[PDB]
Design a protein around this nucleic acid. Structure first.
Lengths: 234, 128
RNA sequence: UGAGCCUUGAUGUGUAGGAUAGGUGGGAGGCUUUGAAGUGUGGACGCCAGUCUGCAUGGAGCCGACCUUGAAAUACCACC
């Protein structure tokens, strides 16, 4: 669903209603709604029946999906206490503090996971910051760190994503590239709906999934029908 | 987001023009600015300008009522007056002088004291 | 004429800054109706260097990240 400014308009001439499709036509339209010169990564937006407004009572965790996500599997670790060399050898591309803060603030921003150890997290989010709170950074408030760097990278390189919310019923997560088929997308959706049920907070509803949509980066969104694994009346 | 401004960025009227009607009475003085159609827009008094009975009847108390009345209509964005006068009280020229000197424009002075063709019997006070 | 429900355009709390880091996550110089860049300049909003908006104008062009506010960023999306 298109947004207007004088500075960027290109999404306006790709959509013309707030309307919901079967998934076999939602991805058919979304391969048109890409606006950028580069072929775009595609995301779900998973809207939730959650009533939490406190960061700790909103959803938080991570998972590995059956198919790819258009995420890079380039992996970075902030650390000054935990096993740097065991992390790098476990398949991390990047380790540091002095220029990792710049690397994330340059070039292509398309990280699959930026990890911290809690040894370094102090200056990553709480007292210091290095990118500001955003999904691209490990979150200053919710649990996104471990002192088991060599495990965390070995999970991450599998194309695992990251989900959390803070004050709003939102998990946005990359699910493919826009060239994906509607079965690859539905099969990553069914995998993620297991993983949100397993990492469900007390303040979420029975009808835990409000609505699901699919949206590319520079380009527009369309809405999808699917909400699977989460009906209350059984 | 930063802190808000010290003085307002907008103002709800800008009517420019009005009439000061003065009732300079024998014990007080009352000043009211009204639009050109006679609907009153704001007002002030001698006695309400910090003077009791003993002081409110003077041209100096009236002079301050005129300033407090200029401030009373300040918000309507009026600046231009002409002037109308009634009553025996001395609030009749000290008012105009401090009004014109309080950033307002006096332009005309006309009396509007009502006089009869004989009329009804006057009151008696102090066997006068 | 009051209120709600709703959709959208506008709007953004970390303070400061020229200003405007709501949340979450993705991603980075982009077209097909339009124009922002940038120069000049009217409108509106605001904090005085800003944002929102328009015209002369480019319309295969162009603002991010450098610069700069700050502990920390800032093309540009979708979702609520």
């Amino acid at each position: 669903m298109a947004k207007l400014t004088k500075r960027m308009r290109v999404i306006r001439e790709k959509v013309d209603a707030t309307k919901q499709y079967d998934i076999n036509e939602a991805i058919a339209l979304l391969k048109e709604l890409a606006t950028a010169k580069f072929v775009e990564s595609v995301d779900v937006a998973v809207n939730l029946g959650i009533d939490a407004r406190k960061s700790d009572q909103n959803v938080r965790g991570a998972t590995v999906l059956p198919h790819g996500t258009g995420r890079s599997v380039r992996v970075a670790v902030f650390t000054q206490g935990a096993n740097a060399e065991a992390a790098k050898a476990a398949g991390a591309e990047l380790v540091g503090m002095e220029d990792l803060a710049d690397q994330i603030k340059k070039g292509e921003m398309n990280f699959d996971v930026v990890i911290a150890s809690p040894d370094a997290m102090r200056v990553v989010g709480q007292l210091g910051q290095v990118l500001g709170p955003r999904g691209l950074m490990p979150n200053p408030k919710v649990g996104t760190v471990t002192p088991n760097v060599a495990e965390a990278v070995k999970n991450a390189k599998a194309g695992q994503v990251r989900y959390r919310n803070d004050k709003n019923g939102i998990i946005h997560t990359t699910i493919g590239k826009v060239d994906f088929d509607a079965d690859k997308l539905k099969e990553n959706l069914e995998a993620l709906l297991v993983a949100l049920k397993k990492a469900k907070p007390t303040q979420a509803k029975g009808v835990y999934i409000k609505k699901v949509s699919i949206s590319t980066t520079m380009g527009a969104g369309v809405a999808v029908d699917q909400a699977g694994l989460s009906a209350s009346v059984n | 987001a930063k802190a808000p401004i010290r003085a307002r960025k907008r103002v709800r009227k800008q009517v420019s023009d009005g009439v000061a009607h003065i009732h300079a009475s024998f014990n007080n003085t009352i000043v009211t600015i009204t639009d050109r159609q006679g609907n009153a827009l704001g007002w002030a008094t001698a006695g309400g300008s910090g003077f009791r009975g003993s002081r409110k009847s003077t041209p100096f108390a009236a002079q301050v009522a005129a300033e407090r009345c200029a401030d009373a209509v300040k918000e309507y964005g009026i600046k231009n007056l002409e002037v109308m006068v009634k009553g025996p009280g001395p609030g009749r020229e000290s008012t105009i002088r401090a009004l014109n000197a309080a950033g307002f424009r006096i332009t005309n002075i006309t009396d509007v004291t009502p006089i009869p063709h004989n009329g009804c019997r006057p009151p008696k006070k102090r066997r006068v």
